[PDB]
Amino acid sequence: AEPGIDKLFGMVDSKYRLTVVVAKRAQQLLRHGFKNTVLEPEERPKMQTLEGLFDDPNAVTWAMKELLTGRLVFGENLVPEDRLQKEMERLYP
Amino acid sequence: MGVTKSALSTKSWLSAASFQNTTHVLTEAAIAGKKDELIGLKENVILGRLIPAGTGSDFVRFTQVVDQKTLKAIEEAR
Amino acid sequence: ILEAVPVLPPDLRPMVQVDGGRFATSDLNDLYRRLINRNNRLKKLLAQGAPEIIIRNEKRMLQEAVDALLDNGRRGAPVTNPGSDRPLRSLTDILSGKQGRFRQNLLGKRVDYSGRSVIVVGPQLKLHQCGLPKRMALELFKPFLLKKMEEKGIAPNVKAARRMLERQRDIKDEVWDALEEVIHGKVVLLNRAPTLHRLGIQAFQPVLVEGQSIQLHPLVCEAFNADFDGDQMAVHVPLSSFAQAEARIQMLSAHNLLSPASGEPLAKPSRDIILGLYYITQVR
Amino acid sequence: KKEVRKVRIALASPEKIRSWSYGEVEKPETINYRTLKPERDGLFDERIFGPIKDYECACGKYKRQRFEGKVCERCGVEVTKSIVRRYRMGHIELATPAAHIWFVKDVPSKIGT
Amino acid sequence: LKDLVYQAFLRLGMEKTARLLDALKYYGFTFSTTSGITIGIDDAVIPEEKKQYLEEADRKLLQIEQAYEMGFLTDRERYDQILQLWTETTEKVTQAVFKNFEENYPFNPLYVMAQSGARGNPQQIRQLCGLRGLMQKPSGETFEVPVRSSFREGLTVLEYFISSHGARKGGADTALRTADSGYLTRKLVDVTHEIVVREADCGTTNYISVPLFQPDEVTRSLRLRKRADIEAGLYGRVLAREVEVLGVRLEEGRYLSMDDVHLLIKAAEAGEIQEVPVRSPLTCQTRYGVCQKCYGYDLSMARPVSIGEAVGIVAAQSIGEPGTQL
Amino acid sequence: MEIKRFGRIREVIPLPPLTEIQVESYRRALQADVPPEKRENVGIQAAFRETFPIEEGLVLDFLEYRLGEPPFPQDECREKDLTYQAPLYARLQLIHKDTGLIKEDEVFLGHIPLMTEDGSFIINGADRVIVSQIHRSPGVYFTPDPARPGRYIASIIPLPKRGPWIDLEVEPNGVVSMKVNKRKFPLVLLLRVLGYDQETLARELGAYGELVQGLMDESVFAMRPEEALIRLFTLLRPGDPPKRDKAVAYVYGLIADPRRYDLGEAGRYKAEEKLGIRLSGRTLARFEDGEFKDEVFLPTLRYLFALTAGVPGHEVDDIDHLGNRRIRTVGELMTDQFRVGLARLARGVRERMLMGSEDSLTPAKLVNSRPLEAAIREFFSRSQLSQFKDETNPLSSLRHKRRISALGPGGLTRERAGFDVRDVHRTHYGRICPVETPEGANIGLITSLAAYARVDELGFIRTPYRRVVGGVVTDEVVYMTATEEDRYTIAQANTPLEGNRIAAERVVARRKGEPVIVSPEEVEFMDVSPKQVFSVNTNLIPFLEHDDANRALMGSNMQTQAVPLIRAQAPVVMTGLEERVVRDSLAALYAEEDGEVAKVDGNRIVVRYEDGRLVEYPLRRFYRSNQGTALDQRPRVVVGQRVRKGDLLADGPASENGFLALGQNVLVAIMPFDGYNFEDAIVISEELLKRDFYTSIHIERYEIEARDTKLGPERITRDIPHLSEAALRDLDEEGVVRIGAEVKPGDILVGRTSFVKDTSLRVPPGEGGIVVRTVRLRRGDPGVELKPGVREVVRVYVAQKRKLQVGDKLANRHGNKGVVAKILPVEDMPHLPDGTPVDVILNPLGVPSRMNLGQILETHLGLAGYFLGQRYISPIFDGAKEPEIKELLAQAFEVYFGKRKGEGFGVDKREVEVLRRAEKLGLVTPGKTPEEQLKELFLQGKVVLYDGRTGEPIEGPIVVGQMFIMKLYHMVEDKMHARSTGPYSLITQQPLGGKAQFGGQRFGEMEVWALEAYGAAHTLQEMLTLKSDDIEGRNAAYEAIIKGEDVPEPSVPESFRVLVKELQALALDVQTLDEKDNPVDIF
DNA sequence: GGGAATCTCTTCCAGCACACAT
RNA sequence: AUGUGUGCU
DNA sequence: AAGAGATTCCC
Ligand SMILES: [Mg+2]
Ligand SMILES: [Zn+2]
Ligand SMILES: [Zn+2]
């Protein structure tokens, strides 16, 4: 099993929608610094050697645990193509 | 018509170029400006492009996701 | 009727040194060779003299020499001088055939990051996961492990980490712990011998298990019809974060609990399980 | 033009045949045994096809990336990696027209019909 | 167990069913080893009435045989006679194998396996304790002398030989078709790779009526369609017009769960509806592809089929997988 | 140790020398034994005179032939890539039409492979063997007509391929059609050729069925003596009517086209014994004065009418009655190829008469050395029929020779016709095993010969049958043919007998191949022993009568791949064939003559023959098998002991004191255990490793060649140009690594360089091990082949001993395969009340669905075997039964329990609990004392067992006992793949190579459809390009992961942009339009 | 102008292995 | 790199 | 190699 996937599949129209959402989320979450997360204070994924999952082990786990809360919104067209790419690299390292 | 007889004559020449006699599927389709509608999987796989289904479906392929921290920044100069 | 002959790009026809000094050139260079030989012999010819036999015979030779380049095997069979009676692989052959550019991706291609071994029952693990021997986990996930070895005090830089795993006795605790930190949520694809239906390849989370055989969960056997009597299975790693994302969502075993063919559970209790349950739930 | 949608095939005119070509293979020359460099404007010449090397040109007037899309003043060498070598086509101007055996030899003669 | 996993799948979810399944896999093992279930030579308890089921058979044929020698029945007829005798006899002894357990040895290590979903088979257990039947000759005919012995007791030399005939045939019937596993999925893929569910709904309203009655079992007699068949023709489909039957009104264009079909058959028994209107790929408007409503349910789970699924390949495979079983 | 036999059917005759089909056939296939003037015309010699007098002035003649002394010995050919052949001399003279007689004896016109005393031929430095072949025997036959079950057709097969295929059919109209080659014509005309009057014909055929009116006629058509020839030629060979037909006479005559199968053997005996009456000469020709004569034709006609009419003694042939299908043995294959070559030689001598100068030309002008060489060389190395000798264990090697294959030269069996041919016909009984057929595809097309069965020159299989005098059994063994067997009533070997007299009013028997119960008078023959039904492997399976035919097959087929264990035990329950198997398979070494022992070394055994002779015996320790296993001969007698003639002195790779040791005897408890024995998986005790139980020795042979290139002469030296001395620490010899060194995946085995970069030989990603032998064939080589261009070869034998690890494949004789799942330590393993733990745990769920209760019994007897320390011999169908096993168990129980009851211990509380539950179960009898309850349980093979990891007794008694389990030839280290990124190829970018990586896994259409059906487009495309062929993106990802970034996707599909170019090479144009039709760049 | 016969071209199947051969 | 053969699935 | 389709020849 995975972090509440039934909530995730129901969360979208098609099952593939969820996959693309999660994927792209992970991508931007890794490319523009792992800081642009939407649940980093206390309710966040952790690991077992140290609690150091707080930085950058897995990309997808984060995306799935994030979507679980109403912090992100998917959809067809939301933001202009280039502008998004620009500002998402500006606001973060 | 039979299943193999069916698939023997798909419009998309890209597909028939693999199974059927290639030199023929190309010679015959060349004389008539045949638009290969890149839709069939087998057809669209010979090239490399993501298969037109699942995570590659147009209905899903073009989707974005953002948070409010960026949504606001974009919201301003809109 | 083409009066200009399009020549293929270089590397698509590699004139390459092999070993000792052997040179493998794709037969295409050899074909393009005689083409120029006749062509130039034709253009220069029209300048000096112009005999009918000479020039006409020349035209025929050209028309044939270009056909050789296009579709070899329709008129005799142009051969490299006594050493190999084989016909030179023409441009037409570079496409048509089992090993061409049409039947190419459809059925072939050997994957890179991968492996295989003998399947074994995997009692002490869940559907979500599978048992994959240490050596494999290390080899398959080599570069990830390199970078994570750099992130910590396991190796100075990338190269030092590359040399760090060179000999088989270097694998210390640090490297293994790192190797656990390089997977966590990552999943691998396990492939059956004859792949038949959709549920013929599943995604499991790798567990670093000792032994040398792939450990596989009991319940997902009847899916891709596997028994433990010599069977083998292959393994891949969906590298891209996108590939990972889709793999652990739509290709993960615990998510595919019903057969696309019919609304029946295909991960139902099988042999031993049912026995054990039936034994305790009957009256005397 | 950023999204490839569908793909059409058709016969190509002499002009179109030459449109993809960046020069004429006016020699049957491949590679010298001594210098593995290309020969006499034949099948491997950088002028028509591409720079045998990476980003470096023929002689060496321009040698790095800073001037990525520039041609050398004295010899024609525009440079990406050895990819522009493997991507660019050249051609051959036959003295006498010749027909495509594909359209000649076929179960239905594409020309005899 | 299977039905339970299915119901719990649609009631508690998918991720939950995972945990449930693994719990079963655990406890089931753990108890399968405490149980002390094992196969001993005695475990294959042979029916007590064996000798009599044979006796009454022998003393039967003794008469029948004589009827031939006098000139009553013909060659064909007696050939069929021996057939009926032994076919009835074997099937009769089977009942003895399975009943003797249920009466005097309820938890028989060989019986609990064959009874539950463990390894075991009715006519197979009939061979360990009861006797093997008549064997197939090398031709389409059968030996008039059945292997009158069981695998537990000494199966005699000659019997083994008249058994090997069919024994080797089996190997052909399986191992030859082990190569044909990539043939039908192949031919079916070549034409179905273009089909995919990339639409929400189509502008059409064409359906078909799946027969809940079979007109052709006897010469021409209409009756209840097979329990199994109907389920595969209605499960997870979409109606074309609202239909009320047992008392509840089935929504128009609704994704039918299995129970929908259940009460539909229970309604068909009382003579309510004869057929059911249903959307199908057979009548989709989408040139290349099928729409969500027209396809139906299946999505490795009981959910509305996701928009974008490669249903062509999936179906071709679904038809290809059990091709080798035929 | 010791034994207790059970078999009570007195084996009247010992089993034949198992390897005779390969040996005797070959010995008879050449006159190298007896002088060139003696008998035995057949074989090579025959082949001579069939194409020897090549009359044209050209008349050669068979003036004796001799060879036999090989270039190089048995072992030396194995080390130096050679053949155990012999230079073919043969004495050959020429006689011209005119005067003058020039002769020149010996001509090196080729070589010829000999055979070891075991049955193989070392070809090209590799032990190979040519199996036998079954095929329809050339002769006259009568089978039903395809479309009409009313009339029948005749058939006259004559091998080889060149040679007609005659069929006689009575056309429904009435006329009888002669079918020659394929074409048809009035047969009456050919009847007229031979000189048949309408009257005599009317007589002979008219005899019965009126059907003669269909042929006898042709008044206007058959009123011409010699003209039938001239007319036949016109109607058969479109051309000119002179004497060409009178010459074709010979073609459907003798010498040429028709079969040269002697006057008496194949054609004769088959024809007569089946149909017709007479054969006058090899085939149909007698031409005293140009005229014709015939014998086979007219009986053929006669028998045809007989069948298509009344009942002149039931005339029906069965296509695959086996009494119609010969068996080309090895010598027949060899001799046939020899004939084929001789023919080509004769074509050469036919050609050369034109290139002659004067008269004499016997030696160097006519007879050449290319045809014969072509015949004999190609065969022993290209024939589908000759293969690698399967030498996993001695038994395997033995079986491989005793096998019969249908697949052959194609003129007899194809590979697109089966299902019906594969079926066990009736006459395979005693002749061919109805079990041995290798499962999987190609099943039925291969069948091993039965035990006692043997070929009788003529080809057909004969079975040993004990005839009987009315009521009493005769001690005469008649070997009957399949066709002769039907003509009798034979009883089974289980029938009760008083010394030699029948003692049962009703006797089980079998008439023309069917179960019939008769009286002691109608018995005429009797099967020797039930052991004659099955091939030897099946006969190495105890309690077979309690196994399914399907399981028994696997059981019989498992032994062929049983790896020779260093400490291999004999089966605790065996059949008796073991002792015979080791000796007949030439596994171990025995004594040749009585005497005492001189010197028992680990390399020799010297024997004290009374005749003042001590003959030297080698005892060879580590000789690499053809498969990879290791063959070791270890001594079994101590110095100062008197041995007898025919007694063992040493053991083979798979023997224990003379018994076929193909595995281990392990105390098995059959019960489910957690999930570890799920499906067919097997649980195993750690103890089995602590005492080297399942340990093998595999010797991997590596090699390198020294090709002398012109761009740079390669050579082997102790020099590796670039980096370390540490890697050269093992390099002892000047170029060769030391013997006894430890090599590991990546370690340097050989040192050599080419044009200077290192191109040496290192140890593959698999595993090295410990070096045992280093063979080096240099330039100054005292008589070797050596590959062209190569100067010298360096072969290294790297051995290693492998223990039983999780993942290895284990199985038994009854046919239960199963890979090892877990090796639980001794403490947490199910153990008896005695301190003794169990070795192997086998799931009971594997039993009922396969109906092989053989394991169950082997285990049962195995219990008593364990506690009495005495193995057993239980013959196939006359071995041990329930009462005997149970009775022995009662005996062992007294040891196992008397020890405790005596020592000061009694019934454990746990035992009592288990008994209490067993009462409710139904096993024990309610009432008895706990001791007697335990007795009742022990009788049933079952015994109280403790969980081991808890102490809690397993509630419910489980059957335990030692069974025979063998480690199969598969291992896991032999098959282990795990490479992420390594070498590729210059010609194809798809990843494979064995430097530091194994090789990339194959990703077929089956897998691609799976990915597509999942809809995992990203993964799939990533799989087809990024990780396979797309070089441009491969390095992208490889650079991405190193830095830690996400894997970049391929923007422009590589295999697409390349296809664009490959398509633009022609006059074709691939336009990549946009969404609304507009050109789009790709580069 | 149609029908039949003959010749030529194309299809040619699930996975890994180990072999050898060309 | 293709064919033959066998082994396992 | 076997089967299917196309082409050519004869009626
Ligand atoms: Mg299996
Ligand atoms: Zn320059
Ligand atoms: Zn639709």
Curated annotation (Swiss-Prot), chain A:
Enzyme nomenclature, EC number: 2.7.7.6
Keyword Glycosyltransferase among record annotations: no
Pfam families per record: RNA_pol_Rpb6
UniProt KW Transcription keyword: yes
GO biological process assignments: DNA-templated transcription
SUPFAM superfamilies on file: RPB6/omega subunit-like
Enzyme class: transferase
A GO CC annotation given for this chain: DNA-directed RNA polymerase complex
HAMAP family: RNApol_bact_RpoZ
Quaternary state and interactors: The RNAP catalytic core consists of 2 alpha, 1 beta, 1 beta' and 1 omega subunit. When a sigma factor is associated with the core the holoenzyme is formed, which can initiate transcription.
Family according to the record: Belongs to the RNA polymerase subunit omega family.
Role, per record: Promotes RNA polymerase assembly. Latches the N- and C-terminal regions of the beta' subunit thereby facilitating its interaction with the beta and alpha subunits.
NCBIfam families hit by this protein: rpoZ (TIGR00690)
Record protein name field: DNA-directed RNA polymerase subunit omega
Annotated source species: Thermus thermophilus (strain ATCC 27634 / DSM 579 / HB8)
Species classification: Bacteria, Thermotogati, Deinococcota, Deinococci, Thermales
Gene (UniProt): rpoZ
UniProtKB/Swiss-Prot annotation, chain E:
Organism: Thermus thermophilus (strain ATCC 27634 / DSM 579 / HB8)
Official protein name in the record: DNA-directed RNA polymerase subunit beta'
Subunit architecture: The RNAP catalytic core consists of 2 alpha, 1 beta, 1 beta' and 1 omega subunit. When a sigma factor is associated with the core the holoenzyme is formed, which can initiate transcription.
Taxonomic path: Bacteria, Thermotogati, Deinococcota, Deinococci, Thermales
Family: Belongs to the RNA polymerase beta' chain family.
Binding site for Zn(2+) 2: 202, 284, 291, 294
Function: DNA-dependent RNA polymerase catalyzes the transcription of DNA into RNA using the four ribonucleoside triphosphates as substrates.
From-to range in the entire protein, with total length: 911 to 1236 of 1524
Recorded superkingdom: Bacteria
UniProtKB/Swiss-Prot annotation, chain F:
Swiss-Prot/TrEMBL catalytic activity: RNA(n) + a ribonucleoside 5'-triphosphate = RNA(n+1) + diphosphate
One Gene Ontology molecular-function label: ribonucleoside binding
Transferase is among the record's keywords: yes
Origin superkingdom: Bacteria
Enzyme class of the recorded protein, top EC level: transferase
Stored InterPro entries: DNA-dir_RNA_pol_bsu_ext_1_sf, DNA-dir_RNA_pol_bsu_external_1, DNA-dir_RNA_pol_su2, DNA-dir_RNAP_su2_dom, DNA-dir_RNAP_su2_hyb_sf, RNA_pol_bsu_bac, RNA_pol_bsu_CS, RNA_pol_bsu_protrusion
Enzyme Commission number(s) of this protein: 2.7.7.6
SUPFAM superfamilies: beta and beta-prime subunits of DNA dependent RNA-polymerase
Gene Ontology terms describing biological process: DNA-templated transcription
Keywords: DNA-directed RNA polymerase, Nucleotidyltransferase, Transcription, Transferase
Signal peptide (UniProt feature, chain positions): none
UniProt xrefs under PROSITE patterns: RNA_POL_BETA
Membership in a protein family: Belongs to the RNA polymerase beta chain family.
Subunit architecture: The RNAP catalytic core consists of 2 alpha, 1 beta, 1 beta' and 1 omega subunit. When a sigma factor is associated with the core the holoenzyme is formed, which can initiate transcription.
Annotated function: DNA-dependent RNA polymerase catalyzes the transcription of DNA into RNA using the four ribonucleoside triphosphates as substrates.
Protein name according to UniProt: DNA-directed RNA polymerase subunit beta
